[PDB]
Motif scaffolding. Structure first.
Motif, short mmCIF file in Angstrom:
data_model
loop_
_atom_site.label_atom_id
_atom_site.label_comp_id
_atom_site.label_asym_id
_atom_site.label_seq_id
_atom_site.Cartn_x
_atom_site.Cartn_y
_atom_site.Cartn_z
N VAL A 145 -95.10 -25.37 -56.41
CA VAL A 145 -95.20 -24.09 -55.71
C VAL A 145 -95.93 -24.27 -54.40
CG1 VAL A 145 -96.00 -21.71 -55.89
CG2 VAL A 145 -95.18 -22.88 -57.94
N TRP A 146 -95.26 -23.92 -53.31
CA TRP A 146 -95.78 -24.09 -51.97
C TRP A 146 -96.08 -22.73 -51.35
CZ3 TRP A 146 -96.66 -29.09 -51.40
CH2 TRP A 146 -95.86 -29.98 -52.10
N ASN A 147 -97.36 -22.48 -51.12
CA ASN A 147 -97.82 -21.23 -50.53
C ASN A 147 -98.01 -21.45 -49.04
OD1 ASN A 147 -98.14 -19.89 -53.16
ND2 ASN A 147 -99.77 -21.39 -53.44
N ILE A 148 -97.19 -20.78 -48.26
CA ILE A 148 -97.11 -21.02 -46.84
C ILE A 148 -97.93 -19.97 -46.08
CG2 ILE A 148 -95.58 -21.45 -44.88
CD1 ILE A 148 -95.06 -23.18 -47.50
N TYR A 149 -98.88 -20.45 -45.29
CA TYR A 149 -99.81 -19.60 -44.55
C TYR A 149 -99.65 -19.76 -43.04
CZ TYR A 149 -102.56 -18.61 -48.74
OH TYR A 149 -102.97 -18.15 -49.97
N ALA A 150 -99.76 -18.66 -42.30
CA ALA A 150 -99.74 -18.69 -40.84
C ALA A 150 -101.08 -19.14 -40.29
CB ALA A 150 -99.46 -17.30 -40.33
N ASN A 151 -101.09 -20.10 -39.36
CA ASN A 151 -102.32 -20.48 -38.67
C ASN A 151 -102.71 -19.56 -37.52
OD1 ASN A 151 -103.25 -22.71 -40.10
ND2 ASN A 151 -102.00 -24.15 -38.93
N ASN A 152 -101.81 -18.69 -37.08
CA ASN A 152 -102.03 -17.89 -35.88
C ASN A 152 -101.26 -16.60 -35.92
OD1 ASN A 152 -99.91 -20.24 -35.19
ND2 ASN A 152 -99.34 -18.46 -33.99
N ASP A 153 -101.70 -15.62 -35.13
CA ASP A 153 -100.98 -14.39 -34.94
C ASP A 153 -99.65 -14.67 -34.23
OD1 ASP A 153 -103.17 -12.84 -35.87
OD2 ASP A 153 -103.72 -12.10 -33.90
N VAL A 154 -98.65 -13.86 -34.56
CA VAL A 154 -97.37 -13.86 -33.87
C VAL A 154 -97.10 -12.45 -33.38
CG1 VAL A 154 -94.87 -14.23 -34.10
CG2 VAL A 154 -96.50 -15.70 -35.32
N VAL A 155 -96.76 -12.31 -32.10
CA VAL A 155 -96.42 -11.02 -31.52
C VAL A 155 -94.92 -10.95 -31.23
CG1 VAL A 155 -96.57 -9.75 -29.32
CG2 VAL A 155 -98.61 -10.31 -30.59
N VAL A 156 -94.35 -9.80 -31.55
CA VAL A 156 -93.01 -9.45 -31.12
C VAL A 156 -93.17 -8.47 -29.95
CG1 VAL A 156 -90.85 -8.37 -31.74
CG2 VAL A 156 -92.01 -9.79 -33.41
N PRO A 157 -92.79 -8.90 -28.73
CA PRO A 157 -92.98 -8.05 -27.55
C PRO A 157 -92.26 -6.73 -27.67
CG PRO A 157 -92.53 -10.26 -26.86
CD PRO A 157 -92.33 -10.24 -28.35
N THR A 158 -92.84 -5.72 -27.02
CA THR A 158 -92.27 -4.37 -26.99
C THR A 158 -91.92 -3.96 -25.57
OG1 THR A 158 -94.49 -3.46 -26.87
CG2 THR A 158 -93.47 -3.64 -29.06
#
Ligand code: BWG
Length: 158
Positions: A145-158
């Motif tokens: 079981v591989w628990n995948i974590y984000a190292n950084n914020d990701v923005v979707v531009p508006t």
């Protein structure tokens, strides 16, 4: 049969769990893919290829946090495309060498039209991926079981 991450975190014979921390493109527009290439992050091998052939699937992939709410997902397993979150176990890939071989998984996550702003938060769980390992020799049926974590914020531009 056992596996490890790019930083050497192991899941041993018999299965288990590990966390995988990934860097993510920090800005992703609607119409673009955020690609999470786990084939550079998770590697596995066969411990007895003289006698045993190992079979490995992506049994399930689940989305969490901002990936669940803000993205439309596809997983590629050994090049073939499937929905993510997943709707079926994939075909088997053969492991027949003691040499580490990538687990050939990548996520392609494209923003949904309602997404905007901080769409994935740093340090958050974004996916849980279950690797299922069997063989042609005995009744072993193990989950990695591989628990995948984000190292950084990701923005979707508006
Ligand atoms: C020497 C011997 O009997 C064994 C050595 N390893 C064994 N078994 C281990 O390695 C196999 C090959 O990767 C896997 O199929 C098994 O599930 C287990 O991980 S049995």
């Amino acid at each position: 049969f056992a596996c490890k991450t790019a930083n050497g975190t192991a899941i041993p014979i018999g299965g288990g769990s590990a966390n995988v921390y990934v860097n993510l493109a920090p800005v992703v527009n609607v119409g673009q893919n955020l690609v999470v290439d786990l084939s550079t992050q998770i590697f596995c091998h066969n411990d007895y290829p003289e006698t045993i052939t190992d079979y490995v699937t992506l049994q399930r992939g689940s989305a969490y946090g901002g990936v669940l709410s803000n993205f439309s997902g596809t997983v590629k397993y050994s090049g073939s495309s499937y929905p993510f979150p997943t709707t079926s176990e994939t075909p088997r890939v053969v492991y027949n060498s003691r040499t580490d071989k990538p687990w050939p998984v990548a996520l392609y996550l494209t923003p949904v039209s309602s997404a905007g702003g901080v769409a994935i938060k740093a340090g958050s769980l974004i996916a849980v991926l279950i690797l299922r390992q069997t063989n042609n020799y005995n009744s072993d049926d193990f989950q990695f079981v591989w628990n995948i974590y984000a190292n950084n914020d990701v923005v979707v531009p508006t």
